[PDB]
Write a protein that holds these residues in place. Structure first.
Motif, PDB file in Angstrom:
ATOM      1  N   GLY A   1       0.805  -1.207   0.009  1.00 46.60           N
ATOM      2  CA  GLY A   1      -0.044  -0.079   0.306  1.00 46.60           C
ATOM      3  C   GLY A   1       0.766   1.225   0.044  1.00 46.60           C
ATOM      4  N   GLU A   2       1.008   1.899   1.381  1.00 45.68           N
ATOM      5  CA  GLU A   2       2.047   3.031   1.382  1.00 45.68           C
ATOM      6  C   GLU A   2       3.292   2.664   1.200  1.00 45.68           C
ATOM      7  OE1 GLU A   2       0.986   5.965   4.233  1.00 45.68           O
ATOM      8  OE2 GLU A   2       1.928   7.678   3.095  1.00 45.68           O
ATOM      9  N   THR A   3       4.281   3.151  -0.115  1.00 46.22           N
ATOM     10  CA  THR A   3       5.501   2.705  -0.210  1.00 46.22           C
ATOM     11  C   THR A   3       6.486   3.998   0.214  1.00 46.22           C
ATOM     12  OG1 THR A   3       5.275   3.246  -2.327  1.00 46.22           O
ATOM     13  CG2 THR A   3       5.036   0.933  -1.662  1.00 46.22           C
ATOM     14  N   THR A   4       5.990   5.103   0.670  1.00 52.37           N
ATOM     15  CA  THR A   4       6.585   6.478   0.742  1.00 52.37           C
ATOM     16  C   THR A   4       7.684   6.102   1.783  1.00 52.37           C
ATOM     17  OG1 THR A   4       4.517   7.666   0.219  1.00 52.37           O
ATOM     18  CG2 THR A   4       6.430   8.802   1.298  1.00 52.37           C
ATOM     19  N   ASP A   5       9.120   6.467   1.305  1.00 50.46           N
ATOM     20  CA  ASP A   5      10.171   6.508   2.423  1.00 50.46           C
ATOM     21  C   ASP A   5       9.611   7.558   3.704  1.00 50.46           C
ATOM     22  OD1 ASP A   5      12.176   5.298   0.723  1.00 50.46           O
ATOM     23  OD2 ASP A   5      13.482   6.561   1.528  1.00 50.46           O
ATOM     24  N   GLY A   6      10.050   6.948   5.037  1.00 50.65           N
ATOM     25  CA  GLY A   6       9.625   7.895   6.121  1.00 50.65           C
ATOM     26  C   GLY A   6       9.506   7.288   7.173  1.00 50.65           C
ATOM     27  N   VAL A   7       9.246   7.774   8.415  1.00 50.09           N
ATOM     28  CA  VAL A   7       8.891   7.113   9.719  1.00 50.09           C
ATOM     29  C   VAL A   7       7.264   6.680   9.649  1.00 50.09           C
ATOM     30  CG1 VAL A   7       9.061   9.365  11.126  1.00 50.09           C
ATOM     31  CG2 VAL A   7       9.193   7.036  12.264  1.00 50.09           C
ATOM     32  N   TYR A   8       7.012   5.786  10.247  1.00 41.39           N
ATOM     33  CA  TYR A   8       5.651   5.382  10.424  1.00 41.39           C
ATOM     34  C   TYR A   8       5.347   4.596  12.011  1.00 41.39           C
ATOM     35  CZ  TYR A   8       5.151   5.217   5.478  1.00 41.39           C
ATOM     36  OH  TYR A   8       4.993   5.478   4.203  1.00 41.39           O
ATOM     37  N   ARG A   9       3.961   4.597  12.417  1.00 47.67           N
ATOM     38  CA  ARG A   9       3.640   4.382  13.320  1.00 47.67           C
ATOM     39  C   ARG A   9       3.012   2.780  13.283  1.00 47.67           C
ATOM     40  NH1 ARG A   9       2.444   8.747  16.899  1.00 47.67           N
ATOM     41  NH2 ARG A   9       1.994  10.654  15.590  1.00 47.67           N
ATOM     42  N   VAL A  10       3.275   1.898  14.141  1.00 43.56           N
ATOM     43  CA  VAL A  10       2.972   0.462  14.116  1.00 43.56           C
ATOM     44  C   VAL A  10       1.620   0.470  14.965  1.00 43.56           C
ATOM     45  CG1 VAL A  10       3.351  -2.007  13.819  1.00 43.56           C
ATOM     46  CG2 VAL A  10       5.192  -0.216  13.565  1.00 43.56           C
ATOM     47  N   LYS A  39       6.374  -8.956  16.413  1.00 46.83           N
ATOM     48  CA  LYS A  39       6.663 -10.594  16.619  1.00 46.83           C
ATOM     49  C   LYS A  39       7.012 -11.198  15.385  1.00 46.83           C
ATOM     50  CE  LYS A  39       6.226 -10.287  21.335  1.00 46.83           C
ATOM     51  NZ  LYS A  39       6.229  -9.012  21.145  1.00 46.83           N
ATOM     52  N   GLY A  40       7.283 -10.862  14.309  1.00 48.48           N
ATOM     53  CA  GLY A  40       7.428 -11.421  13.035  1.00 48.48           C
ATOM     54  C   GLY A  40       5.897 -11.376  12.289  1.00 48.48           C
ATOM     55  N   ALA A  41       4.977 -10.804  12.842  1.00 50.64           N
ATOM     56  CA  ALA A  41       3.658 -11.060  12.278  1.00 50.64           C
ATOM     57  C   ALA A  41       3.509 -10.055  10.895  1.00 50.64           C
ATOM     58  CB  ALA A  41       2.409 -10.418  13.573  1.00 50.64           C
ATOM     59  N   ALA A  42       2.737 -10.333  10.032  1.00 48.76           N
ATOM     60  CA  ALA A  42       2.370  -9.670   8.728  1.00 48.76           C
ATOM     61  C   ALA A  42       1.937  -8.235   9.493  1.00 48.76           C
ATOM     62  CB  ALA A  42       1.653 -10.092   7.818  1.00 48.76           C
ATOM     63  N   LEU A  43       2.258  -7.254   8.513  1.00 51.79           N
ATOM     64  CA  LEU A  43       1.556  -6.009   8.750  1.00 51.79           C
ATOM     65  C   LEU A  43       0.860  -5.136   7.463  1.00 51.79           C
ATOM     66  CD1 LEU A  43       4.776  -4.172  10.002  1.00 51.79           C
ATOM     67  CD2 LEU A  43       3.176  -5.312  11.323  1.00 51.79           C
ATOM     68  N   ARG A  44      -0.185  -4.642   7.664  1.00 52.50           N
ATOM     69  CA  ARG A  44      -1.150  -4.143   6.696  1.00 52.50           C
ATOM     70  C   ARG A  44      -0.950  -2.475   6.505  1.00 52.50           C
ATOM     71  NH1 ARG A  44      -6.153  -1.700   8.080  1.00 52.50           N
ATOM     72  NH2 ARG A  44      -6.069  -2.773  10.293  1.00 52.50           N
ATOM     73  N   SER A  45      -0.625  -2.128   5.128  1.00 56.93           N
ATOM     74  CA  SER A  45      -0.485  -0.732   4.911  1.00 56.93           C
ATOM     75  C   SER A  45      -1.602  -0.205   4.052  1.00 56.93           C
ATOM     76  CB  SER A  45       0.900  -0.691   4.086  1.00 56.93           C
ATOM     77  OG  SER A  45       1.171   0.651   3.989  1.00 56.93           O
ATOM     78  N   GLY A  46      -2.848   0.260   4.725  1.00 55.40           N
ATOM     79  CA  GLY A  46      -3.869   0.443   3.966  1.00 55.40           C
ATOM     80  C   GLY A  46      -4.490  -0.789   3.442  1.00 55.40           C
ATOM     81  N   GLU A  47      -4.766  -0.874   2.078  1.00 48.18           N
ATOM     82  CA  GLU A  47      -5.213  -2.029   1.290  1.00 48.18           C
ATOM     83  C   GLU A  47      -4.041  -3.131   1.182  1.00 48.18           C
ATOM     84  OE1 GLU A  47      -8.021  -3.136  -2.518  1.00 48.18           O
ATOM     85  OE2 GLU A  47      -7.313  -0.976  -2.200  1.00 48.18           O
ATOM     86  N   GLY A  48      -2.887  -2.863   1.149  1.00 53.07           N
ATOM     87  CA  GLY A  48      -1.921  -3.673   0.979  1.00 53.07           C
ATOM     88  C   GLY A  48      -1.130  -4.403   2.122  1.00 53.07           C
ATOM     89  N   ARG A  49      -0.373  -5.595   1.783  1.00 53.71           N
ATOM     90  CA  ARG A  49       0.169  -6.393   2.922  1.00 53.71           C
ATOM     91  C   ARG A  49       1.847  -6.473   2.750  1.00 53.71           C
ATOM     92  NH1 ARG A  49      -1.999 -12.154   4.404  1.00 53.71           N
ATOM     93  NH2 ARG A  49      -0.514 -12.995   5.887  1.00 53.71           N
TER      94      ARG A  49
END
Ligand SMILES: O=C(Nc1ccc2c(c1)CNCCO2)c1cc(Cl)cc2[nH]ncc12
Lengths: 156, 39
Positions: A1-10, A39-49
């Motif tokens: 989903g969001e691929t923009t370089d930068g800092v992100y919250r989990v 914990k090595g779990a998959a993350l979601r970025s909007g619609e993307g994985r």
């Protein structure tokens, strides 16, 4: 989903409301964070994985979509900046001179700033804005304060 | 299920809040990624 370089919250919706478990750095299409956050779990970025690619519990690091891309290191002399991203608060740069963690396998830089555990994965930056490590894995001292290591991964 | 939201750019901010000390601590790293103070 969001691929923009930068800092992100989990974030996570598994607990009451939305809770910030940590922070990460998106660089060159790779999401870098601390292992104890996801914990090595998959993350979601909007619609993307985002699927995990590399991880190590001892280094306490994890990369998504590709291998670890961050390779800058603290010079041992200069002040650095912790780009702290605290839960429910704005991203903030805090300048400090790091200390040292003296270990049997060598010395490591250390940031003595105090933040909630949800700030884990925040990037430590050098004078050029290069990520020299992640904040979130360290020790608790005599006065209950937190001193984190400047945890950097290996770029292959 | 975990998800990510952008929080900003990664840049050095000149004239930022300068705080914090530089302690030299003898530490140990275990197999589980836990740091500990050595005395
Ligand atoms: O608890 C914190 N970090 C952490 C938690 C769990 C964990 C690890 C690190 C890695 N070692 C293996 C076990 O997994 C933590 C992080 C920050 Cl940014 C501030 C804090 N103030 N007090 C604790 C903290």
């Amino acid at each position: 989903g969001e691929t923009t370089d930068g800092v992100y919250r989990v974030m996570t919706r598994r607990l009451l409301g939305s809770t910030q478990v940590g922070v990460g750095v998106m660089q060159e299409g790779v999401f870098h964070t601390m292992w104890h956050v996801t914990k090595g779990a998959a993350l979601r970025s909007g619609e993307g994985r985002l699927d995990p690619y590399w991880g190590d519990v001892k280094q306490d690091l994890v990369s998504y979509c590709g291998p670890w891309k961050l390779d800058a290191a603290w010079d041992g002399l200069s002040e650095v900046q912790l780009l702290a991203v605290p839960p429910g608060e704005r991203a903030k740069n805090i300048q400090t001179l790091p200390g040292i963690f003296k270990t049997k396998d060598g010395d490591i830089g250390a940031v003595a700033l105090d933040y909630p555990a949800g700030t884990s994965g925040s990037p430590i930056l050098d004078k050029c804005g290069r990520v020299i490590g992640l904040y979130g894995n360290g020790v608790v001292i005599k006065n209950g304060s937190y001193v984190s290591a400047i945890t950097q991964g290996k770029r292959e | 299920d975990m998800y990510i939201e952008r929080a900003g750019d990664i840049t050095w901010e000149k004239d930022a809040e300068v705080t914090g000390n530089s302690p030299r601590l003898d530490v140990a790293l275990d197999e589980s990624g836990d740091f500990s103070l050595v005395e």
